């Protein structure tokens, strides 16, 4: 019941169309596709092997380019899994096979069914304590409120998110009561709305590079306060900073290749705490 907890992952491969056909925001350098595989192999043996959690892999889809990033897909609180209805209309076929996984894992299952709503789970940033969800160009206001309705028991609340980006593009949990957070305008100018409509203040860890404010968090039994975040050779100041947090258990872990298709840590896995 402690925040961060899991005993689930639920992961996806990559399809060889990945690397020209994934939507991203900026124009930039070529993927390579096979570097990424090793990349994301990597990250899923952290998860797995290091860490112990029980992995689902779901197999690739080349109709599918952007079917690595899982959690746009699905948004899981406790045993209740919302099956989203993804901003892109290219991604919604992703939510086929993780409806599958799910029931399989035997979950509450809620999928947004309204036609007028978009939500990613990329958007949204469960504290533990409530909900943030990033109005964007991908998720809207009906998307926020069917997430309100599935999670009743907690609060939500919006943040306007600019451009192409998620909410987590720039934050995430990295404790109980921590948020993760870039330096840049944007992420302040959020982080200051989080803050002020929020019934408590949170802690916060800040970071000089946005993308590096993206981390995972897994509270692991009997092992550590578990922090998956950018490497050195990534993002050298921002390491600098996980660093200091001599209680957690760093795990440095690259994710260059997908990031140029704005995949970043968070985005790879939905983890779940089944009991
Ligand atoms: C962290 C997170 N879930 N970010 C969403 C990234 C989506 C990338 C993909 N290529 C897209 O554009 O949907």
Same mark, same amino acid.
């Not at 930039?28 to 096979?34: C, I, Q, R």
């Not at 599958?100 to 978009?118: C, G, P, Y």
């Not at 957070?181 to 000089?208: C, F, N, W």
């Not at 690259?254 to 970043?264: P, R």
């Given at each position: 019941?402690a925040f961060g907890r899991a005993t689930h992952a639920?992961?996806?491969?990559?399809?060889?169309?990945?690397?020209?056909?994934?939507?991203?925001?900026?124009?930039?350098?070529?993927?390579?596709?096979?570097?990424?595989?090793?990349?994301?192999?990597?990250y899923?043996?952290v998860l797995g092997?290091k860490l112990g959690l029980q992995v689902?892999?779901?197999?690739?889809?080349? #109709?599918?380019?952007?079917?690595?990033?899982?959690?746009?897909?699905?948004?899981? !609180?406790?045993?209740?899994?919302?099956?989203?209805?993804?901003?892109?209309?290219?991604?919604?076929?992703?939510?086929?096979?993780?409806?599958? @996984?799910?029931?399989? +894992?035997?979950?509450?299952?809620?999928?947004?069914?309204?036609?007028?709503?978009? &939500?990613?789970?990329?958007?949204? &940033?469960? %504290?533990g304590?409530?909900?943030?969800?990033? &109005?964007?160009?991908? %998720?809207?206001?009906?998307?926020?409120?069917?997430?309100?309705?599935?999670?009743?028991?907690?609060?939500?609340?919006?943040?306007?998110?600019?451009?192409? &980006?998620?909410?987590?593009?720039?934050?995430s949990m990295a404790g109980p009561?921590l948020?993760?957070?870039?330096?840049?305008?944007?992420?302040?100018?959020?982080?200051?709305? *989080?803050?002020? *409509?929020?019934?408590?203040?949170?802690?916060?860890?800040?970071?000089?590079?946005?993308? @590096?404010?993206?981390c995972i968090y897994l509270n692991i039994p009997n092992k550590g306060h578990v922090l998956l975040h950018?490497?050195?050779?990534?993002?050298?100041?921002? @390491?600098?900073?996980?660093?200091?947090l001599?209680?957690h258990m760093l795990i440095?872990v #690259?994710? #260059?290749? +997908?990031?140029?298709?704005?995949?970043?840590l968070t985005? !790879?896995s939905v983890l779940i705490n089944?009991?």
């Open positions: 019941a639920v992961v996806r491969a990559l399809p060889e169309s990945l690397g020209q056909h994934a939507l991203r925001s900026a124009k930039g350098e070529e993927v390579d596709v096979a570097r990424a595989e090793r990349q994301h192999q990597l899923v043996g092997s689902v892999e779901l197999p690739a889809d080349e #109709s599918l380019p952007d079917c690595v990033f899982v959690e746009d897909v699905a948004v899981v !609180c406790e045993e209740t899994a919302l099956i989203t209805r993804p901003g892109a209309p290219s991604r919604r076929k992703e939510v086929d096979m993780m409806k599958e @996984a799910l029931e399989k +894992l035997q979950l509450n299952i809620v999928e947004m069914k309204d036609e007028n709503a978009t &939500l990613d789970g990329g958007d949204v &940033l469960f %504290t304590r409530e909900f943030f969800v990033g &109005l964007s160009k991908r %998720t809207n206001q009906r998307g926020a409120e069917i997430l309100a309705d599935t999670f009743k028991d907690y609060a939500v609340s919006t943040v306007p998110v600019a451009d192409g &980006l998620h909410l987590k593009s720039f934050c009561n948020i993760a957070i870039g330096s840049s305008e944007s992420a302040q100018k959020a982080l200051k709305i *989080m803050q002020q *409509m929020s019934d408590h203040r949170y802690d916060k860890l800040t970071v000089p590079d946005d993308i @590096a404010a993206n950018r490497t050195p050779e990534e993002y050298p100041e921002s @390491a600098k900073v996980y660093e200091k001599k209680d440095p #690259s994710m #260059s290749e +997908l990031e140029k298709v704005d995949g970043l985005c !790879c089944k009991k």
